[PDB]
Structures are given as structure tokens and as C-alpha cells.
């Protein structure tokens, strides 16, 4: 009844161009079985959305990677938020929601916007730049560590640590095993910065520690919650901003619409998140036997969700393979859906918006002018190098 496929969604060929295989996965049925890894897969919007929105049946506390925490030891202590189910999830989630709240965005927006305008001005002096190292990486590095309250020294550990975290959700392939082999110095740095004395006053880390006297979290939970933001809040935004620049470089008509109405910047970024989906895949584990899209899945089974595929499913989206900055994007699953839906989404959207607003106001053209190179990770999609010429407005 359930079709069995040999597609390896963690292979380099798949990362190089996942879109044909994603259609094959959607069109094979609502639920497939991936023989390479002994997991169920869901690639259509409907089932991805259903799984995300039933956290009781499709839990997170057995891990959101391939590894089942009931069978193997987690590679690092479990996250108190991502790898927790309700009710243990609820109070840590509420703390991070308040630390990254609608109200908190008002304290950082002026500085984030000024940094984005300054970066675009600097890049325009050079003309030909690498939109990954020089923009997608450089901009979030220029704002997010400081907003966290991290010291300057050792920040070179942050992107390697995040790449490790996202590789470690995958299967025990070479990408994952090499990442873990190299991990000790990055883990050591990250764990140390999570302690209260190492986080500058007023930043996100200090604010998490301040919540430890409200009864929502205890002091010994705060370092792991700081760890969550250092894991999840940098490399994702690098790949989101890189995706947006790549979309504007490939679709110049949409750059022209964005220049003509810079208030489209926030939706242009949201559409890039749908179109490229920085976070491509991750897992749940069933807590009982369950019927999903007509298939029966037993207890204790890993279920792989294809978020990028859900975001391109023609059953849900008109012209899914077009980048359209005025699309009604509400309902895309690039930030997840339901109780775990990205708690950092307002930070991500703020960074993306202000960078795209700077480009909309300052840049007339974005032309790819060198070899584009992809960066490979078990669950993140993005580029290693994106040579572009920026022409000033
Ligand atoms: C474009 C950028 C981003 C993308 C595409 C993204 C994507 C996601 C997704 C898909 C999830 C849901 C995971 C799940 O359901 O298991 C998530 C959760 C989360 N994200 Fe993001 N994210 C981004 C930026 C950020 C930022 C800037 C931060 C923090 C400052 C952050 C922190 C978190 C945390 C802590 C969680 C766990 C939430 C929970 O389990 O309740 N993310 N993100
Ligand atoms: O709590 C953490 O350490 C954490 C939180 C979220 C993520 C993530 C996976 C997919 C999207 O976001 C990774 C790590
Ligand atoms: Cl760690
Ligand atoms: Mg069984």
C-alpha cells in the first residue's frame, strides 16, 4: 500500500537539485517509505502541515533528526525547546517568545537597518562581490552576535557550530560524521558563552537569564536556551538572505518591482523563504500507530517531512516554481507550523526585510558574474558562493 522509494534525500545529488525527486516523492503518494534510511516520508503540503500540527502523535522529544533518542544517545544534551514536547516545551517556548517578542523588535530595528544600509553602501564601493561571504554571511555576523551579547573573540566558531547542528539532524553519513569529529572546539566555545557572566547586558542572552526569577525557567535552564539561539538563529538567516539575493539575481523583473515599491521588502523575503526553504527537512517520531493520508504508520517510527517540497506543492500553490514577491505567502511552512513554529521568525524577517529594503533603495541591478557554488548540509539549503555585480541606483 505504501510505495517504497530508493531516493536518498541526504545525498549530494539530491542537494544539488532536489526538485525532480521532490515531485517523484509527492506524486508517489501522500506517504512513502524511504528504504535507504528506514523512515516514512511526507512531501505534499497537506501531510507536512498535518504532521507539524499534531505534536502529540508526531512528537519532537525523540529527536527531530534521524536518530531516535529512545534508541541512541543524543550527540549533545537535548534542546529544552526544539527537542521537547508539551507540556515540557511550553514554558521554555514562552520565555524565548518574550525574549524575541513583537515588542523586542522595536529595540533592535534601528541598528539592524543602519547596518544593512551600511553593508550595501560598502558593497557598492567594490561593485563585484560574493553575495554569500560578503553579504549573506557578513550582514548577520555584523548584527546577530552583538544582539545576543557575545564578546568579539571566538565568533568564528558560530557558523561551524550551526552547520554541525544542522548536519547532525541527518543520517550518519559522511557529512554528519565529519561534522561531529570536528565539533569539540565549537561546542566548548558555545557552551561557555551561554553562561550568564559572558552575555552582555540588554542582549538576548542576558534577557533569557533574567527570566530565571519569574518561575518560567530555572537558572540551570537558561544556558541551554541561549544555546538554542546560537544554534538556530545565525546560519538559518545566512541562508535566508542568500536565498533572497539569489532569487533577485535570477528574477530581475522581481528586483524591478521591489525597487519600484520597497515596502514589498518583507514579502519579498518571505517569498524567498518559501521558494528556497533554508530549512529543507526534519523529522518527527510517532508515539502511537496512526493513519496519515490513508496509510497506517506504526508506533516509534521516524517521519521525514519535506518542507521545501510542501512549499512547492502545486496542490497548494499556484505556479509554485515561480518567485513572486506579491504572492500571498501565508501558510508556507518554511518556518514550520504549530507549536514549534520558528520562535525566531520576527528576528529573521527583520534582518531579511531591512537588507532587501537597502537593496531596493540602493541597487539598480544584481547580475551573476562568476561560478555559483552550492553548500552541502543534511538539512540546510543554500549557497557557498554567489559572485554578483551590484550596479548602483
Ligand atoms: C530564515 C531564517 C529561519 C528559518 C527558515 C527558520 C526555520 C525554522 C523552523 C522550520 C523551525 C521549526 C522546527 C520544528 O518544527 O521542529 C524553527 C524553529 C526554531 N527556530 Fe528558526 N528559523 C529561522 C531563523 C531563526 C532565528 C533568527 C532564530 C533565533 C534568533 C531561530 C530560532 C529557532 C528556535 C529556538 C526554534 C525552536 C522553536 C520551538 O521548538 O518551539 N530561528 N525555525
Ligand atoms: O534549540 C535548538 O538548539 C535549535 C532550535 C531549532 C533548530 C532548527 C531545526 C530546524 C529549524 O530550526 C535547531 C536547533
Ligand atoms: Cl554544544
Ligand atoms: Mg512496530
Supply the DSSP string of 181-236, one letter for each residue: HT-HHHHHHHHHHTSGGGS-TTSHHHHHHHGGGTTSS-GGGHHHHHHHHHHHSSHH
As beta bridge partners, residue 213 has none
Tell me the C-alpha distance between 230 and 276, whole Å: 22
Is the bond into 46 cis (omega within 30 degrees of 0)? no
Q: Is the CB of 273 under 6 A from ligand 1?
A: yes
Query: Do 358 and 116 contact (CB within 8 A), yes or no?
Result: yes
Distance in Å from the first CA to the final CA of the chain: 58
- Report the binding-site residues for heme b: 89, 93, 284, 340, 342
CB of 222 sitting under 6 A from ligand 1: no
Tell me whether strands 58-59 and 128-130 are parallel, antiparallel or unpaired. unpaired
Atom of ligand 1 nearest to the CA of 333: 10
How many C-beta atoms lie closer than 10 Å to residue 390's C-beta? 26
Task: Report CA(297)–ligand 4 centroid distance (Å).
Answer: 8
Is residue 164 within a helix (H) or strand (E), and if so which, with residue range?
Answer: helix 158-168
Q: Is the CB of 286 under 6 A from ligand 1?
A: no
Report helix, strand and coil shares of the chain as percent, to nearest 5.
50, 15, 35
Cα-based torsion angle of the residue sequence 301, 307, 311, 316 in order, rounded to the nearest 10 degrees: 20
Nearest-CA residue for atom 7 of ligand 2: 232
For 91, the grid coordinates are 514554558
Phi, psi for 337 (deg, rounded to 5): -165, 140
**What SS3 class is residue 93?**
helix
Q: Computed from CA positions of residues 84, 237, 317, 376, in that sequence, does the dihedral angle turn out positive or negative?
A: negative
- Ligand 2 pocket (Cβ < 6 Å) reads 79, 81-82, 165, 227-228, 231-232, 279, 282
Q: How far is the CA of 1 from the centre of ligand 4 (A)?
A: 17
- Residue 291 in 3-state DSSP? strand
**Per-position DSSP letters for 114-157, written without gaps between them:** HHHHHHHHHHHHH-EEETIIIIIIHHHHHHHHHHHT--STTGGG
The count of other CB atoms within 10 Å of the CB of residue 373 is 12
The strand pairing partners of 385, in sequence order, are 373
Method used to solve the structure? X-ray
Instruction: Let me know if 174 is exposed, middle or buried by CB neighbors in 10 A (0-12, 13-18, 19+).
Output: exposed
**Contact at 8 Å (CB) between 335 and 348?**
yes
18 alpha carbon – ligand 2 mean position (Å): 22
The resolution in Å comes to 1.4
Give dist(CA 186, CA 188) in Å, integer. 5
Which cell goes with 135?
553579504
Closest residue by Cα to atom 12, ligand 2, is: 232
Residue ranges with CB less than 5 Å from ion ligand 3: 76, 187
Q: Which of 335, 337, 338 to mutate to test the pocket of ligand 1 (most atoms within 8 A of CB)?
A: 335
Q: How far is CA 111 from the centre of its chain?
A: 23
Distance 69 CA to ligand 4 centre (A): 16
Using CA atoms, how far apart are residues 331 and 165, in angstroms rounded to an integer? 26
- In this structure, are residues 26 and 313 in contact, taking their beta carbons and an 8 Å threshold? yes
DSSP classification of residue 78: P
Determine the Cα–Cα distance for residues 119 and 358; give it in Å rounded to an integer: 9
Nearest to 48 by CA among 243, 278, 246, 316: 316
Tell me if 144 CB under 6 Å of ligand 1: no
Judged by DSSP in three states, 279 sits in strand
How far does the centroid of ligand 2 lie from the alpha carbon of residue 82, in Å? 6
Verify whether ligand 1 is closer than 6 Å to residue 48 (CB atom): no
Q: Whose CA is nearest to atom 13 of ligand 2?
A: 232
Amino acid at each position: 500500500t505504501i510505495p517504497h522509494l530508493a531516493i536518498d534525500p541526504f545525498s549530494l545529488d539530491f542537494f544539488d537539485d532536489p526538485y525532480p525527486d521532490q515531485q517523484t516523492l509527492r506524486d508517489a503518494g501522500p506517504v512513502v517509505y524511504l528504504d535507504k534510511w528506514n523512515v516514512y516520508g511526507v512531501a505534499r503540503y497537506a501531510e507536512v502541515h498535518a504532521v507539524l500540527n499534531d505534536p502529540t502523535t508526531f512528537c519532537s522529544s525523540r529527536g527531530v533528526g534521524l536518530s531516535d533518542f529512545k534508541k541512541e544517545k543524543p550527540w549533545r544534551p537535548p534542546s529544552l525547546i526544539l527537542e521537547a514536547d508539551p507540556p515540557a516545551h511550553t514554558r521554555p517556548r514562552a520565555v524565548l517568545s518574550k525574549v524575541l517578542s513583537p515588542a523586542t523588535m522595536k529595540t533592535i530595528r534601528d541598528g539592524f537597518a543602519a547596518a544593512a544600509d551600511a553593508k550595501v553602501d560598502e558593497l557598492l564601493q567594490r561593485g563585484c562581490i560574493d553575495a554569500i561571504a560578503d553579504l549573506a554571511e557578513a550582514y548577520p555576523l555584523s548584527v546577530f552576535p552583538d544582539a545576543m551579547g557575545l564578546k568579539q573573540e571566538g565568533r568564528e566558531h558560530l557558523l561551524p557550530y550551526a552547520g554541525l547542528v544542522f548536519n547532525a539532524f541527518g543520517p550518519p553519513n559522511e557529512l554528519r560524521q565529519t561534522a561531529i569529529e570536528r565539533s569539540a572546539p565549537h561546542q566548548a566555545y558555545v557552551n561557555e558563552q551561554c553562561q550568564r557572566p559572558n552575555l552582555a547586558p540588554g542582549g538576548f542572552g542576558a534577557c533569557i537569564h533574567a527570566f530565571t526569577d519569574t518561575g518560567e525557567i530555572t537558572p540551570d535552564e537558561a544556558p541551554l536556551l541561549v544555546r538554542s539561539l546560537l544554534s538556530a538563529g545565525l546560519d538559518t538567516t545566512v541562508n535566508g538572505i542568500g536565498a533572497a539575493v539569489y532569487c533577485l539575481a535570477r528574477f530581475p523583473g522581481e528586483l524591478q518591482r521591489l525597487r519600484s515599491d520597497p515596502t514589498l521588502a518583507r514579502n519579498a523575503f518571505e517569498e524567498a523563504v518559501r521558494f528556497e526553504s533554508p530549512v529543507q527537512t526534519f523529522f518527527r517520531t510517532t508515539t502511537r500507530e496512526v493513519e496519515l493520508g490513508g496509510a497506517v504508520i506504526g508506533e516509534g517510527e521516524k517521519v521525514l517531512m519535506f518542507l521545501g517540497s510542501a512549499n512547492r506543492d502545486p496542490r497548494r500553490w499556484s505556479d509554485p516554481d515561480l518567485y513572486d514577491i506579491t504572492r500571498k505567502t501565508s501558510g508556507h511552512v518554511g518556518f514550520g507550523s504549530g507549536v514549534h513554529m520558528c520562535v525566531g521568525q520576527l528576528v529573521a524577517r527583520l534582518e531579511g526585510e531591512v537588507m532587501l529594503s537597502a537593496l531596493a533603495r540602493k541597487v539598480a541591478a544584481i547580475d551573476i558574474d562568476g561560478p555559483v557554488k552550492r553548500r552541502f548540509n543534511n538539512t540546510l539549503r543554500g549557497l557557498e558562493s554567489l559572485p554578483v555585480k551590484l550596479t548602483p541606483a
